[PDB]
């Protein structure tokens, strides 16, 4: 039931930002993110 498929690549999930002349979003919490970067 497997096959090779061909498709137009997606660029990412689409997001509509809730902009208004008097609205702000402020983060009530945080995460600490450790990410690895490899260089020759």
């Amino acid at each position: 039931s497997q096959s090779i498929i061909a498709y137009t690549m997606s660029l990412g999930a689409e997001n509509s930002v809730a902009y208004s002349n008097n609205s702000i979003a402020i983060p009530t919490n945080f995460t600490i993110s450790v990410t690895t970067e490899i260089l020759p």
């Binding site: 690549m9 660029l11 990412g12 999930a13 689409e14 997001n15 509509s16 930002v17 809730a18 902009y19 208004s20 002349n21 008097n22 609205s23 702000i24 979003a25 402020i26 983060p27």
Partner: protein, 315 residues
């Protein structure tokens, strides 16, 4: 940010329509496969370079239907829906100001189409004007644009109150400065000279590579059929090899040229990816990294095989 991807049929460039020349070209072993590994290593990184620059955004951000920016008018730098590709007004200036097989040579398409580079650019622009730097460091958090600019004024050491008092002027100055961007780009030819020079090179190099076939390299003809019709096998091969040796050096000179050029384009793509991260997804304290003045913000714009940053600065 990138240059044209090429690949070449080494055997068709050197020996096109000749079994005799192909059977002599086997004497050099891996003198053609390596050339193809070199041109592939270049072509694979033109797609890398493009992504490194444009694909820095997690989600395709969209602008609100209502443009309540408080005065700042980005219509000239925002997508225009009445088009087959949703480029901005300034991006369609940039795409007009740069003007762009029997030799076994061929040109490969980029992985991301000009529509996908425009969608990444739109999302970056949208997130920047709806959420400031916050989409670079987490999820996009909305903030009002004038208030966002107030922070940007604090970032240059200017007190937020100043911006609110001159908000309209500040909005007028910006709208008048984006007005001058288009006029300049519409009127002036040499503004995209950096991108036209890369296309000119990709074209001069392929033109020189094809023109070489006409060269004798000291053989009795540049045509394999003349050598093969006029001389016997043991004499004809010498003239065929005369071309081979010279053609194979004409290919090795091209591939080396592309490798050296590809390192210049990679350094420019790595710089453009750094200006995307530090000038578009942030605000930069680095002097003269995001234009002359105290950098406030930047808007990315897509161009043929490259990127345009519209840097906004307090002077």
């Amino acid at each position: 940010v990138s240059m044209t991807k090429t690949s070449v049929d080494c055997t068709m460039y050197i020996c096109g329509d000749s079994t005799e020349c192909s059977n002599l070209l086997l004497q050099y072993g891996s003198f053609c496969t390596q050339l193809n590994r070199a041109l592939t290593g270049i072509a694979v990184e033109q797609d890398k370079n493009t992504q490194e620059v444009f694909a820095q955004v997690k989600q395709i951000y969209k602008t609100p239907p209502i443009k309540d920016f408080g005065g700042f008018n980005f219509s000239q730098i925002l997508p225009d829906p009445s088009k087959p590709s949703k480029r901005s007004f300034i991006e369609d200036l940039l795409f007009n100001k740069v003007t762009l097989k029997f030799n076994g040579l061929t040109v490969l398409p980029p992985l991301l189409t000009d529509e996908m580079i425009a969608q990444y650019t739109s999302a970056l622009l949208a997130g920047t004007i709806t959420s400031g730097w916050t989409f670079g460091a987490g999820a996009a958090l909305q903030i009002p644009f004038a208030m966002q600019m107030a922070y940007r004024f604090n970032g240059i050491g200017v007190t937020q109150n100043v911006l609110y008092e001159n908000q309209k002027l500040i909005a007028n100055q910006f709208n008048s400065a984006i007005g001058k961007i288009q006029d300049s780009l519409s009127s002036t030819a040499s503004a995209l000279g950096k991108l036209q020079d890369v296309v000119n090179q990709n074209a001069q190099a392929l033109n020189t590579l094809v023109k070489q076939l006409s060269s004798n390299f000291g053989a009795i003809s540049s045509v394999l059929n003349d050598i093969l019709s006029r001389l016997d096998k043991v004499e004809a091969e010498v003239q065929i090899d005369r071309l081979i040796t010279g053609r194979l050096q004409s290919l090795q000179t091209y591939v080396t040229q592309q490798l050296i050029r590809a390192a210049e384009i990679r350094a420019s793509a790595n710089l453009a990816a750094t200006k995307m991260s530090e000038c578009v997804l942030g605000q930069s304290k680095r002097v003269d990294f995001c234009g002359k003045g105290y950098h406030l913000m930047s808007f990315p714009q897509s161009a043929p095989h490259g990127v345009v940053f519209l840097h906004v600065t307090y002077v």
